Point group: none
Chain length 139, copies 10
């Protein structure tokens, strides 16, 4: 069952990003805090939509896609990925990682249903690395 993040925590994090900036160690610590439980693509996408401005959000979408593509290359380079399965029918496509696959587009409940925990942690680590890249790039 999907539970959304508190809008109070999200508002506090947005104001933190607004006053301290993207690169301060306190901001990265707060992001790591709100990045503790494995989030669904819907959660991370809306979170970055709210806390980041338009141009940093575009940059972050780009960087997140690139990092997820590196993850999928490593996944096709190793059939023992915690997102993959043993047979070929469990291979994870980027539509399933970005939340674009069938039964997931716009629906967080179905998303949480079909996604694997390894998928969730890989998406989360990818999003964190992308946030780091964009923060280092913006300023």
């Amino acid at each position: 069952a999907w539970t959304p993040l508190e809008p109070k925590l999200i508002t506090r994090l947005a104001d933190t990003v607004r006053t301290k900036g993207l690169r301060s160690p306190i901001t990265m610590a707060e992001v790591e805090a709100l990045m503790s439980s494995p989030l669904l693509p819907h959660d991370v996408t809306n979170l970055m939509r709210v806390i980041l401005g338009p141009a940093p959000y575009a940059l972050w979408m780009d960087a997140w896609g690139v990092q997820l593509q590196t993850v999928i290359a490593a996944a096709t380079r190793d059939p023992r990925h915690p997102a993959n399965g043993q047979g070929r029918g469990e291979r994870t496509n980027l539509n399933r990682l970005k939340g674009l696959a069938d039964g997931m587009v716009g629906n967080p409940q179905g998303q949480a249903a079909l996604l694997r925990p390894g998928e969730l942690v890989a998406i989360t680590a990818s999003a964190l690395q992308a946030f780091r890249e964009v923060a280092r790039l913006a300023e």
Copy 2:
């Protein structure tokens, strides 16, 4: 109004890009016409230093994110 947005003489580029993308996406344009308009507004607004910086791009930039990344890389630190 998006077509009246200029990058101020003292304004940074990320603020100008934020303002422009906001005004273009929150307007009456179709969804399929926002990216070309944002690109062509980056090229013609964004005072002539950044205009020449985008003009002399050895690669072809075909996305607002790519233009923003390129300009942020090669911008005149000041």
Copy 3:
């Protein structure tokens, strides 16, 4: 049977030569047009008498004679010339090429009678080459600079014109045009060409690149 060229076409060509000059590509195209069917020495001689002034006509007579002499040397160097025959009795003398042979002097009908089609096409090609020589002679690339206010397409036009209408071999024009684009073409475009992530190996490619990335002003 000999048919003369229209005096209307000849008058139009003469006025073209009068306004555009001898060397314009439109003039050379018009001459190639009126040089389509193989002409008899009478036709080409009268044509050059009408379209060219006195001094260019003298120069053209000289050049035509020289080119015809080269043709006759190649003909005596190969008995299989389309103007020649197999036996020695068909060897073509310059009196027959210039229309000076017996039964031809001043008479275009007899001319058309005795002349061969290979003779006609050789005379025609010789006259065309002579016209080209005289046109290149009648009217400096290394002194061409792009002015401070001049656009780049005008500079490229002027430079390519002066380089192609010069004494360089044909195989040396493209490298010279490129290296003149790089060293002339005032330092803004010089730096624009220098910092080219791709290697430009043709004047057209350099022109396209510069037109794309030029400073709009």
Copy 4:
């Protein structure tokens, strides 16, 4: 049998390009007019040599080559090209399109002899598109 274009029409078109420019709709209409019958590579090459200046002519040679290369890629992607034949012996090389093949270099009569009508119309459409590109680029 090859018939050349009238130098009167070519002179009028050259003066049109000289006064109105390359991009005016009247100029493009005039070019479409003189581009009505399928022209041999010799015809189009001399036409562009006369009506265009040196630098636009270089640009046009480049663009024409690129468009012809796209055409030849589509031709090797479909053996039913009106320029191609059914067997492999009728495949059309760029030397045959640009007029550089054997029996064609400098000779318009032989050109008209060996060329196909599909070849002619493809060359003509390629030249028209290249003219459009160069006109959009020059000004």
Copy 5:
């Protein structure tokens, strides 16, 4: 002092590179810290024309020799 070296307005790039590499290698830095410092000094010194020339490098330059070669290739002849 290496951190005070700037490329003069009229100085060529090979002279500036010689002076900078001399002052960096003849200093108190560890041997494993000279190449990154030389690179980052090429990027921030070396007046803004060469700064932008290095910034807009389609390839990633990870050695002072490679940076010198690239700049010598694409430099503005003047």
Copy 6:
């Protein structure tokens, strides 16, 4: 047994590079001289460390690595390389070429022990080509004019130097040198070359003619 190069020769070569530069033909001849016997990586590395400045030395290290990599690609493309052996156990790695392999780092004696003569000559040729590249890189013909007070032999020397040390094809240098003699070389010599009763078709002939008929002053 390893024998070092004389520091006297190295000092003379360093001063030659200091006064004449990297690209002079005398400097390249001197380098070819000191590049006669096959050198060990230690020798060439120290030689370039001494004769070259810091930035040219960095450039040369880069170029030497690239050329050695091309050599190793050709070596893996042909098992009959004079550096390679017949079996796979003699394949030569870049650590062995750059002197980085085991038993060689910093020790020239062990280096000379384990290295092959084919290895040595390949390293030497690679280093020579890298030196040529860096020399061509470290340091415009169409901008050369004969000064009002400059003599003609100095102008000809400067022009031929800049034309031959440029990016032109080899078959385009003589026509360019001639046409630059004709259009540069201030109008007195321009008219002197123009009014040549003979046709001059070589830079040497033009130089001889001008030196004969020049205005002594």
Copy 7:
């Protein structure tokens, strides 16, 4: 009148040659006397720069066309 034709100080040589050949061929001279007269008028008219240019001809010019070609080759571009 052919014997009154001079090359003006600012006139080019091809115009002078055209005018002179016109006036000599459209005159009362016999046909066999036109070429020598045209040559000797090229030599004595045609202001002293071209006069000296024709005088110092290493080859012997025996035809108006050859003289015109030589002068056009070696003329002072101005």
Copy 8:
């Protein structure tokens, strides 16, 4: 077996030519010194390439060709030339004197193999006379 001249002697001679000039008696003495043993066309050509500037080198190539042509005229005027042989098959062509013949172009070893000692001394004397002419002409 071919042995090259020392680059040290060549460097000293080049600096002598640079400071004293081409016509000084000390320079001519030094050239006579380095012109002691019969040199192959490769040696003399590279020597003049190094010690002479570009324009004097062009002049010297011209003069050397002219003097070699005079030598070949004297050789066809006397079948007892130390470069010639008794039969017609040993007649020496200018391609063999200038080093342009077959098996000699660019290869000094093959050059030294096929050349005669009379050929070498004739080439050397010709080069010396050409150097004298160019030195008298340059200044």
Copy 9:
């Protein structure tokens, strides 16, 4: 004295040649040394217009009479 003879700024060339040949032949030189001296005095005296006229001689003049003829042909009429 022959070695002090110069062609005056206003003097014609035949007068200068007469004076020079007179002073050279009526001097203490050997008979076999008069022609080379007369030639080399024509070349170095005879003010720079005629000096350049003799210098740019497409033919080689090896006799005082030939030099005099050439100069009289191609001299600047004034």
Copy 10:
């Protein structure tokens, strides 16, 4: 037997050349008068030495040599020259015409001994034509 020309006539002719010039018809008539009998090279040479200045004398020596060379070319083009003979042993060299041959240098008596009347008239006509050329050239 050689008889010299009167110094009185030579003085009168020299003063005529001095007052009237070289080109006057009276001067040419006087020269034709003193050019009536066939003169030996000594006579004409001394005559031109006396009547002409130094520079006209140099010009006249040049022109006389050229005309004598044309005469000798015509003589080798026709073995029936009044100066030549029938066999090859009577062919007339320029040393015999200019008075430079053996037994003639400086001696007018020996000159008159060995010279032919055809030789004398050819020398005389050559000298007259050379005088005409120099007179037309001097003014």
